[PDB]
Design an enzyme around this catalytic site. Structure first.
Site, short mmCIF file in Angstrom:
data_model
loop_
_atom_site.label_atom_id
_atom_site.label_comp_id
_atom_site.label_asym_id
_atom_site.label_seq_id
_atom_site.Cartn_x
_atom_site.Cartn_y
_atom_site.Cartn_z
N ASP A 180 0.85 -1.22 0.00
CA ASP A 180 0.00 0.00 0.00
C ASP A 180 0.88 1.26 0.00
OD1 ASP A 180 -1.96 -2.00 0.36
OD2 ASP A 180 -3.04 -0.85 1.99
N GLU A 201 -0.69 -9.75 11.19
CA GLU A 201 -0.55 -9.18 9.83
C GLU A 201 0.92 -8.87 9.52
OE1 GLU A 201 -3.02 -5.66 9.12
OE2 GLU A 201 -2.71 -5.92 6.97
N1 LIG Z 1 -0.95 2.41 4.34
N2 LIG Z 1 -2.12 1.80 4.86
N3 LIG Z 1 -2.34 2.00 6.27
C1 LIG Z 1 -2.96 0.93 7.08
C2 LIG Z 1 -3.64 -0.08 6.41
C3 LIG Z 1 -4.25 -1.14 7.10
C4 LIG Z 1 -4.18 -1.19 8.48
N4 LIG Z 1 -4.83 -2.29 9.18
C5 LIG Z 1 -5.92 -3.11 8.56
C6 LIG Z 1 -7.07 -2.31 7.88
C7 LIG Z 1 -7.72 -3.09 6.71
C8 LIG Z 1 -9.16 -3.25 6.63
N5 LIG Z 1 -9.77 -3.90 5.60
C9 LIG Z 1 -9.04 -4.41 4.61
C10 LIG Z 1 -7.58 -4.24 4.65
C11 LIG Z 1 -6.72 -4.88 3.54
C12 LIG Z 1 -5.55 -5.69 4.18
N6 LIG Z 1 -4.59 -5.95 3.40
C13 LIG Z 1 -3.77 -4.75 3.02
C14 LIG Z 1 -2.47 -5.25 2.36
O1 LIG Z 1 -1.51 -4.18 2.13
C15 LIG Z 1 -2.85 -5.87 1.12
O2 LIG Z 1 -1.63 -6.30 0.37
C16 LIG Z 1 -3.69 -7.04 1.38
O3 LIG Z 1 -4.03 -7.65 0.13
C17 LIG Z 1 -4.94 -6.71 2.23
C18 LIG Z 1 -5.67 -8.02 2.63
O4 LIG Z 1 -4.85 -8.96 3.39
N7 LIG Z 1 -6.98 -3.61 5.69
C19 LIG Z 1 -3.53 -0.20 9.15
N8 LIG Z 1 -3.47 -0.25 10.61
O5 LIG Z 1 -4.08 -1.30 11.41
O6 LIG Z 1 -2.78 0.78 11.20
C20 LIG Z 1 -2.87 0.90 8.46
#
Ligand SMILES: [N-]=[N+]=Nc1ccc(NCCc2cncc(CCN3C[C@H](O)[C@@H](O)[C@H](O)[C@H]3CO)n2)c([N+](=O)[O-])c1
Length: 765
Positions: A538, A735
């Protein structure tokens, strides 16, 4: 014979606990059919049950942990839930009994044990919620002999086209049932199992909590109307016991109140099979599923030194079982912008601004319906299909059951549109949409995601070249069946390959750019000033500002993965004219990786932009991206470029932490900055790729064999021990892991590609 293995796989996998979004429920791989859900909560007061009741997965201070101890989607398994708020340790054992013409039968045991801190007289409300969607289908609670409810089993008898005739039994169970001495008991009974049979329009049956609470609130309104008041109130648990009204409908609420420990069975009997399923049947089938799971694990996940010990076997069983136990069935409409607005072409400078303006038209519409059968990253936070995560999920799953993995690949590729687009994020139906903020639902046909599903197809093919047990390997053991699957899938692989080439094309010709090929160059669409969501990394630092002239070395490396797979598969199929074009595309990528992406200055691959002066500039941010041609297996074991990357990987001042490879170098200016998501933390999916490639260089004649062997040994150890220590301390897969402290951070229950660690321990890649 393909049709036969197909029809047998269909019949094996039809039933599951395929609702990972909730603590426990069942549905078949059928959009509009019979579903079940479990709910429970202590009741201590007249207002507390609305706050204590459990249904959809969460993770907060009120929940210690939960997940699968053991799971195979063909057999069933066992889930443990540790609920601090409700003072309960729950076990949900699920088992499938093959038979008949309809996907077989199944059984579940729900067992609640109060923990040490719970009042020994706690009253716990338990609900089994049964819905059925369909026009020409019926379901009926057989009424009780008793006036006010049920002394024994609740029998539901139903029928649909999809299931034929079936009966669903909720047994009396064991445990104390409180008895009320209040005047109300003359009209509600002193306390017993109750059923309400309701009907709602089919498309809201999933909203089980509001459906339940509407009925609870009608009961309380009735108490008020009939003069049951605060001068002399019935006890809370009777106030929250539904008036028995069994009958026919598309919703059946079965409710039990227990005092102390409890258990009860759910028995699903397909009429079209032998005799009906019993509790003695459930107990035996469970014991046997445990023996089989035990036996398969020890073969398939034979943990190598230094992880041979029982502590690591438990760990491995928990990480694996949670991964394959996350498998869900998803059905419904998805939200999609099909405007193909020209702003999405991102061909001018400041394209992110124009793209925002197009999104603000809000042309996106519901379309489908779609079905998807997939594993998920996280039950509590995002229980749905993610395209590049699934490539990682399926690597351990494929080892366990290659026919299951191919079933999931097939389900993902059946989503692909006429252009070769699969949405990166699959939110199918209103139940799935309930968990996602409206602003984040819309899929964009110009958004790619890494094609990691090809890595799985690679393992399949390698294995192809070299009854439940039988079905699991049917597609490698019967080569004719294996090739037919590949023959049917190949065209869509080609379609996706071309789609990458039409939609994620970089621009050489329009700039001062020389390279061996005028064709091979790629740029991820969808990028904003801070983000490239579509790459999967991301907030990994990219060229600033974003620019139509950008080139992404990870994206080219993924096209490289895709061509090599298409070469292998195409050859197994004899599509000669295609293999020639692929053999030539690959050759051009190998060169253009060096000409467009290799930095001699920095000793690593980098992304590229064009300058304020309109010349090709390398933009080097030492980290995961820098390694991609290596991570994706594109370099020669004798390559000097591989030599320099091994140096970077093993360098403690850059990427090498005691806990694994840092997403970004400590020496990079962006280390630890902003949301710091892919800007330092250790991610298991990229470390998994590094470990596999290190092991490949390590077991080959070449100059770096011995360096590769050292780095493999240590990185395997660092990654496993980090994920183990955190699991031991917290009971969660995380994660990502802090490189300074080794602590699990961000999303818990990430099973999820952190579960790759079972494959890292098993070795022999
Ligand atoms: N930059 N950004 N900042 C942040 C981004 C997320 C954060 N926490 C989880 C939130 C969240 C909710 N719903 C869906 C998803 C997608 C998760 N993930 C993302 C992977 O990158 C991707 O590759 C991968 O496919 C997908 C699926 O596994 N994530 C946090 N945090 O908790 O501070 C900061």
């Amino acid at each position: 014979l393909h049709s036969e293995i197909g029809r047998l796989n269909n019949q094996s996998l039809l039933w599951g606990p395929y609702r990972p979004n909730i603590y426990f429920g069942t549905r078949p791989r059928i959009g509009k059919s019979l579903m079940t859900g479990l709910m429970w909560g202590k009741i201590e007061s007249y207002t507390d049950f609305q706050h204590t009741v459990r249904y959809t997965c969460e993770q907060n201070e009120g929940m210690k942990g939960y997940g699968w101890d053991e799971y195979d989607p063909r057999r069933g398994g066992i889930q443990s839930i540790h609920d601090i708020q409700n003072g309960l340790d729950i076990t949900t054992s699920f088992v499938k009994i093959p038979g008949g013409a309809h996907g077989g039968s199944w059984a579940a045991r729900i067992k609640g044990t109060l923990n040490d801190d719970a009042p020994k007289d706690q009253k716990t409300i338990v609900v089994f919620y049964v819905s059925q969607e369909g026009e020409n289908s019926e379901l009926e609670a057989v009424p009780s002999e008793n006036e006010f409810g049920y002394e024994g089993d609740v029998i539901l008898k139903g029928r649909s086209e999809a299931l034929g005739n079936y009966k669903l039994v909720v047994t009396k169970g064991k445990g104390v049932i409180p008895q009320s001495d209040h005047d109300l008991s003359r009209l509600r009974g002193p306390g017993q199992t109750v059923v309400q049979s309701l009907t709602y329009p089919d498309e809201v049956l999933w909203q089980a909590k509001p459906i339940l609470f509407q009925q609870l609130k009608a009961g309380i309104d009735w108490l008020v109307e009939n003069k049951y008041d605060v001068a002399d109130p019935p006890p809370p648990w009777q106030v929250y016991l539904l008036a028995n009204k069994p009958g026919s409908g598309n919703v059946h609420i079965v409710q039990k109140v227990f005092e102390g420990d409890f258990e009860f069975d759910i028995l699903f009997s397909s009429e079209s099979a032998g005799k009906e399923v019993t509790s003695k049947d459930l107990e035996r089938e469970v014991k046997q599923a445990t023996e089989v799971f035990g036996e398969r694990f020890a073969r398939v996940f034979d943990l190598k030194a230094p992880f041979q010990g029982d502590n690591y076997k438990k760990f491995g069983k928990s990480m694996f079982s949670n991964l394959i136990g996350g498998i869900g069935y998803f059905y419904g409409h998805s939200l999609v912008d099909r405007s193909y607005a020209p702003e999405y072409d991102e061909e001018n400078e400041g394209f992110w601004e124009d793209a925002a303006e197009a999104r603000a038209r809000h042309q996106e519409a519901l379309e489908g319906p779609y079905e998807l059968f997939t594993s998920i990253p996280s039950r509590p936070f995002f229980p749905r299909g993610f395209l590049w995560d699934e490539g990682f999920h399926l690597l351990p799953i494929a080892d366990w059951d290659i026919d299951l993995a191919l079933e999931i690949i097939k389900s993902w590729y059946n989503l692909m549109d006429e252009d070769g687009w699969i949405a990166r994020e699959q939110i199918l139906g209103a139940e799935a949409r309930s968990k996602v903020p409206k602003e984040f639902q819309t899929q964009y046909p110009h958004y790619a995601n890494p094609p990691t599903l090809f890595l799985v197809l690679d393992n399949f093919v390698e294995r192809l070249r070299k009854l439940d047990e039988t079905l699991s390997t049917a597609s490698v053991d019967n080569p004719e069946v294996g090739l037919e699957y590949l023959r049917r899938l190949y065209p869509l692989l080609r379609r996706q390959f071309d789609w990458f080439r039409k939609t994620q094309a970089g621009d050489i010709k329009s700039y001062d750019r020389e390279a061996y090929s005028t064709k091979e160059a790629y740029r991820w669409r969808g990028r904003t000033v801070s983000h490239c969501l579509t790459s999967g990394l991301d907030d990994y630092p990219r060229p600033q500002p974003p620019h139509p002239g950008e080139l992404h070395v990870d994206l080219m490396s993924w096209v490289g993965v895709m061509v090599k797979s298409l070469i292998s598969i195409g050859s197994l199929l004899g599509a000669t004219e295609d293999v020639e074009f692929y053999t030539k595309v690959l050759d051009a990528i190998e060169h253009n990786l060096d000409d467009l992406h290799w930095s001699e200055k920095e000793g690593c691959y980098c992304d590229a932009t064009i300058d304020e002066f309109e010349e090709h500039k390398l933009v080097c941010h030492k980290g995961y991206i820098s390694l991609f041609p290596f991570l994706t297996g594109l370099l020669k074991p004798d390559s000097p470029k591989l030599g320099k990357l091994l140096a970077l990987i093993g360098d403690e001042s850059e990427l090498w932490s005691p806990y694994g490879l840092r997403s970004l170098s400590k020496k990079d200016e962006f280390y630890g900055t902003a949301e710091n998501y892919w800007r330092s933390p250790v991610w298991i999916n990229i470390n998994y790729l590094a470990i596999v490639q290190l092991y490949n260089i390590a077991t080959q004649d070449g100059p770096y064999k011995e360096t590769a062997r050292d780095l493999y040994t240590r990185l395997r150890k660092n990654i496993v021990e980090t994920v183990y220590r955190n699991w031991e301390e917290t009971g969660f897969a995380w994660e990502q892991y802090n490189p300074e402290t080794g602590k699990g951070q961000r999303t818990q229950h990430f099973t999820g590609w952190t579960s790759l660690v079972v494959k890292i321990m098993s070795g022999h890649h």
